[PDB]
Design a protein around this nucleic acid. Sequence first.
RNA 1: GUGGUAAUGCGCACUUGCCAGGUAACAAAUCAAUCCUCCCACGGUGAGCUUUCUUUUCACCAUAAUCCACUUGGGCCUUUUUACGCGUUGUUCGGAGCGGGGGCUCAAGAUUGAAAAAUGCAGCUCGUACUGUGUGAGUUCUGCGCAUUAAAGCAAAAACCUGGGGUGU
RNA 2: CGCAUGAAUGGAUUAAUGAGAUUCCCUCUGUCCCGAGUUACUAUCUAGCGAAACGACAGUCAAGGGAACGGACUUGAAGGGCUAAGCGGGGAAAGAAGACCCUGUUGAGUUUGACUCCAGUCUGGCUCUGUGCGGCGACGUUGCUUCACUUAUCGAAUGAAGAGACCAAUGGGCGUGCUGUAAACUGAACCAACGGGUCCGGAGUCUUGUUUCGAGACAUCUGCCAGAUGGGGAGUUU
RNA 3: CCCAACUGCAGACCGUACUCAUCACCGCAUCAGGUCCCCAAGCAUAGAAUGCUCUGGUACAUAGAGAAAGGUACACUCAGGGAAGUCGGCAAAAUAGAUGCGUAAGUUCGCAAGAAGCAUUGGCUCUGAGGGCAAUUGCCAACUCAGAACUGCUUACGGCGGGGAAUCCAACUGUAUAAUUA
RNA 4: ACACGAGUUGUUCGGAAACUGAGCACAACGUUAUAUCGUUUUGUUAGGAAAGUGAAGGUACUGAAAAGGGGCAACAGAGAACCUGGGAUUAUAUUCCAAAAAGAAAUUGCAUGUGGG
RNA 5: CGGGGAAACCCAGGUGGAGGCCUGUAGCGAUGCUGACGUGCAAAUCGCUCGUAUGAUUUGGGUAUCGGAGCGAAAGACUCA
Lengths: 50, 252, 91
Amino acid sequence: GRFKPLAVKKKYAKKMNQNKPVPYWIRLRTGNRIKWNEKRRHWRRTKLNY
Amino acid sequence: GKTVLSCRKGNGSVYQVHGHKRLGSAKLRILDYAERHGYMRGVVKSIEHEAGRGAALARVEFRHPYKFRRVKELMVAPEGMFTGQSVFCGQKAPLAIGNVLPLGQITEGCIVCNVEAKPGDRGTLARASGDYCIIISHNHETGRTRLKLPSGQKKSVPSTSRAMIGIISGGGRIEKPVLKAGNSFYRFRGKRNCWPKVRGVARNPVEHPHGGGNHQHIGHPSTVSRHSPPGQKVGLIAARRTGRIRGGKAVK
Amino acid sequence: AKRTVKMGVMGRYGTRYGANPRKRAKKLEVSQHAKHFCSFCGKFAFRRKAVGIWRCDGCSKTVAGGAYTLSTPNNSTVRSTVRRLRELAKI
RNA sequence: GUGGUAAUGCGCACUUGCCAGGUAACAAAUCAAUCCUCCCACGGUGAGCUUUCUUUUCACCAUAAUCCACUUGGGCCUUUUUACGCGUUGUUCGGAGCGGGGGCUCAAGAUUGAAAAAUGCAGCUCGUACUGUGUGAGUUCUGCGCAUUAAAGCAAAAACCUGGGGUGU
RNA sequence: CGCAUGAAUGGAUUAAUGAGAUUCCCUCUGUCCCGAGUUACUAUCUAGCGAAACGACAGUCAAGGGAACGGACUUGAAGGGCUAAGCGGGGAAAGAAGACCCUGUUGAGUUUGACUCCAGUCUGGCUCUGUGCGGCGACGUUGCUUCACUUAUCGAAUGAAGAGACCAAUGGGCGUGCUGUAAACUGAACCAACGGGUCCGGAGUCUUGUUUCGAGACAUCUGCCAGAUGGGGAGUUU
RNA sequence: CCCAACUGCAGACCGUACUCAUCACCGCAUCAGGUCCCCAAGCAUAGAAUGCUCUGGUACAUAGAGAAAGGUACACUCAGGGAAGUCGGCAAAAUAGAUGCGUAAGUUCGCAAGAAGCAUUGGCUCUGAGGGCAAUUGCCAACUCAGAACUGCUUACGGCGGGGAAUCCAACUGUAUAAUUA
RNA sequence: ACACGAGUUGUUCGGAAACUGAGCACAACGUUAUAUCGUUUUGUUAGGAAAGUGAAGGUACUGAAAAGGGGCAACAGAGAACCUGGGAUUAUAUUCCAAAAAGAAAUUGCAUGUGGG
RNA sequence: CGGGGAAACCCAGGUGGAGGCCUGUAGCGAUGCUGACGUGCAAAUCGCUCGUAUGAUUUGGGUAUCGGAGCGAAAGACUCA
């Protein structure tokens, strides 16, 4: 819909930023574990209800 | 088992008065100094209809006895009360239809409506369409006035009580058959959630003491004691009589 | 012509609610849709509005008269007795 | 403040000190019906069809808000008096003032201008200049409410408005 | 002569109405005699994709006995292997720790004349709880009690808006607060004019004091104690 | 200090994408289910029924070859008989639009009733009737109904009631066991 | 799908500032061993002293008048001052366009100037 | 509007548009096939047929009443499969 509180708009603003993939260099840190981002998301599944 | 439906109406959840479309309470004018020592004179500004009342109300506009302003009272119109009429209310007020006199001032056998059972009550009784009291006798020592009412019982009101002369507006209503479930619909719509009403023998035994089975039937006498607890009192509550009244109908 | 023998205003309930209850409503049904004499102007102008509210078309007066008619039969006594019962006290 | 016999017209002030009333505010059906849509008529530009036929078939032909200066329907005044007459598709109305003459006002429009052709659209010319610009069927905005069957009678308040009284005096 | 019909536990009728129950008739028909042909989409074969139910091991029969109805054992008869589409006789086929029935010192929903109690409603006593003249009793006191009171308390109304008095005792140290109305039929009223010497009037003053009205020591008041009722509700058994 | 017509400067806050569904939501999913509101063309027709079409939008739903049996169908037909089938006319067939005539018992006088039943219908060329406006006369629009002559039927889209004689029950409209009982 | 950049523009559009409705429950009061309970719109809280406003007058005192505390609940009710044109876009628009604003208006606040009082 | 009658009233033609009225869309339902499906399109769907369709109608948002309790035109219905 068009309506939204602004407080709710930001929560989706944050969650849009967090969907980016794991940087390529950060795999190369010495003693590194993280490979691909495990918290990624797609609106088609697991819907935020904010 | 489950609670009986006559008990669930006691919560007042869904079963409260609707009363949105209503105009407010209908009372006689306040009892004032002028009301007691004199009369205040208003004028009937309109005659209209509460949703869910069978009578016809009246907006009567007095003038304020103290400040400069004009107060509007809403009372239950007598029979021939017409728009533009001047209504007198007080002790000096002459005896005429629609005027409000203190009930000790009214003759002997007059027809009276909208009585107040307590001197300052602004009227509680004989307020239903077509109903009127008949004042019987004034007792000049004790200061009481005996009168019959609509149910035939005869009561004694303190004679400083006020009264309105003449029968109440509506009349009838009852004398006309409804003919359909449909006219019974908006009937109570302006009143309550009273309707339609499932009779007890149809409903299951948890919900009602009549809730029996193979053959719709009560199975135990339907007359119930006065001391029966809530959820039990059902049917005829402490009936002195039962069945057809063949002659008699003594006032109940 | 005359398009019903008896039923009259009740022909709108076609076969339906039974002879005697229809016939009993018909009285009170034609009463309220009748035009009643207005003792103020003199026309027969009153129409029933709501229950008991009777408005004159010539006068624009409204009256509390009630039910399906202007004056219920025991109103006439109540109005005549007090005309008597006021008059008797004045002397 | 001030004109008209009058319905009411015209543009020194302040009034939420107080009061009174309005707007906001609600409603069937029938009939008529606004913007607008469709169809027909007129004929201008391009296109389609062409063995034969078709003065032809298809598309387009537009004017926003805002602000200025005859018709239809209602309420009303003055005049002449009416008891049969006026009027609707329709269940009406009048000495508590019908009908007629002449007027006042309100509602919905029509019209002529400002805006506004400088725009839009189409065609065409050697990325420019030119050319073109209805007594029909629907339609709920409206007439329209003290307004529907009704033992159904159809929310309220802010905010605004005018008056009473007063201030100016 | 109704096993066992019957009167608002409603009896008897009943036009109109019904996706209600039933029976005949006309019409019509592949419902049928008795089946036949045609169509789309399947099944069928292919390309791509590609599961589940189920699964001890397995799988041809006759007879015998057996847990008394065998794929296996006994004695016979069949049996070359591998396959595609069907089919529904068997696998006492698949689903689901039989819902029927019984059992268990397992329940649960309801009912009542079960056993056992609980709220609710009523009832008694004390209490709340005061004052005065009295009447009946009991042994000056006390139980009860008629009546007249008003401050506890209770019921109501009001924007707590005008009580009572002045009219004076069983007190204390003419009338009764009074412009207006007498069937009714829609007008208005404010923010003092004015008089008297900035005050006092206009607009009476006073207070053993309640806001006013009704009831009133009563009960529908309050609390505890006591009994009756009590499937409305609880526990458990049967 | 107020009023009047202009002028001067300023006019802050949040949403604003996209979707609203045979794929954007809920139903474990891009699920033949469900989900409020607004705009709504042409012809046939009584029409928002139903059939086809210009603007807009689509060719996405796994496909190809293809005559087995057996099936499913928002698919048909059948000689003679016509309910003998079957628990039972289940399913199918049948009836059918509009106009005119006609219509029983029973009845609460309202109905029953579209009772039942009979007949007409196209195409073409004509004729009559039904009005408006302007000053008897002149000019004009938009449709409907009736009648006639000639000529044709292979009875030919879609859509659209089978009907009658009685018994039982409930008076009627309504509600009602979402997912076996309406 | 995935990856990498970009995209949502308002004095007037919707809300809020500022309406009331079915209703809700903060204060207050009362209950409860305990508030995490009840009352709280029939004109309106509370045994209840909840007004911070100021008519007239005297020069920031004097006191008429006003009874009934605070707030929320409507993106379909009430209320609301703006319209089209475009070559203004890959994607937003009654939102953007700048001197010939493509332009034409409406309205709120304050302020100066001229005209009047 | 006309006709009949001494009267009371009675007949006929139009207008009008009443009804929990009838046919029929959407809408709301859910009768029959005991049709499809029945490891589905679907943990109740689909096809034709059928009920009602100006009313006790259908529907959005808000708001109120729930666990021995709520709500119920009463079926042990419903209270997030």
